[PDB]
Design a binder for this molecule. Structure first.
Ligand code: ERU
Ligand code: ERU
Lengths: 164, 164
């Protein structure tokens, strides 16, 4: 305890229904975080992070540009998203998520594997993976888009490799 | 039947274990395909595709550049991968997948949502989801890389919206 996120091997994903039945996936290419944890016992002590909203991906310029617009994220007015863990208990990461200028308490379900050793450079690391779901409309993201076109519900998955 | 894949809302995903405990996900940004199907009954009649191996993504240059080397895919020698369905039965796409110059039989579990109507332009479509797994080593890709560094098992997910 503490840990630094390896960015080449770490990821922040979302998945949202498109037209009810197809799952549209994307990432934020640019994020940062703080982690402090006991690899034995697997307790998380510190867990916060930030996403840079302009780095949203999805792999389609048209869609992604439209996502940074006032119709969805409003990147100009809100360049960042943030999450601060406020409580850890047995796999539950309770925390305040802030998106589009709104903060809501949420809970991510998490899994830690640790202590691990990078078989190349011999350095100690941990994998942290977490999953939640939120309603984009609770954060006022895309009110004008119906659930039948863009799902209200958004699955969040974090996949982190972090070096002691 | 026939149908024409909407490339803007379709994707080809893979997922493989990194150092056993974390998943590396990525896509082929560029692919083509043929589909013929019955909206009712949900029978698939024709299902084939090609991917351009150079479009491999993963969002990491050092990694993606390595994947394209003779160490893995050798894109300079095998520019393409391809799949053709050989038989459709009780929700399963049986077919032949060709990667790195090797063809092997693979089974994909399919899920068809059809008939669907585009809420905006009222045009008819379907969502086709297909999932399966291969051993990358069965095709000779990355023989020198241990399963504990890069998983031998690779999960394939196809997510297509296709318009009549
Ligand atoms: C890294 C440690 C702390 C984690 C920071 C968490 C930030 C939250 C990560 C994801 C948050 C969810 C953002 C909502 C994305 C959904 C965007 C709407 C996509 C619409 C798709 C479309 N069809 O146009
Ligand atoms: C209908 C289209 C036909 C194509 C269907 C095939 C879909 C994908 C097929 C194979 C995917 C194999 C991908 C395995 C890539 C290995 C990724 C290794 C990443 C980490 C490597 C490292 N050294 O860090």
């Amino acid at each position: 305890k503490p840990y630094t996120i390896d960015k080449a091997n770490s990821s922040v994903w979302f998945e949202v229904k498109h037209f009810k039945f197809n799952e549209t996936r994307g990432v934020f290419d640019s994020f940062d975080g703080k982690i402090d944890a006991d690899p034995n016992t697997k307790a998380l002590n510190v867990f916060e992070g930030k996403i840079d909203i302009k780095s949203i991906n999805t792999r389609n310029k048209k869609r992604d540009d439209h996502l940074k617009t006032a119709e969805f994220f409003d990147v100009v007015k809100y360049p960042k998203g943030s999450f601060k863990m406020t409580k850890y208990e047995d796999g539950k990461i309770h925390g305040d998520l802030t998106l589009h200028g709104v903060t809501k308490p949420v809970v991510l379900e998490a899994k830690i594997q640790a202590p691990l050793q990078n078989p190349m450079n011999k350095k100690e690391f941990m994998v942290l993976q977490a999953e939640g779901k939120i309603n984009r409309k609770d954060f006022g993201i895309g009110k004008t888009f119906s659930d039948a076109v863009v799902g209200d519900e958004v699955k969040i998955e974090l996949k982190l490799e972090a070096y002691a």
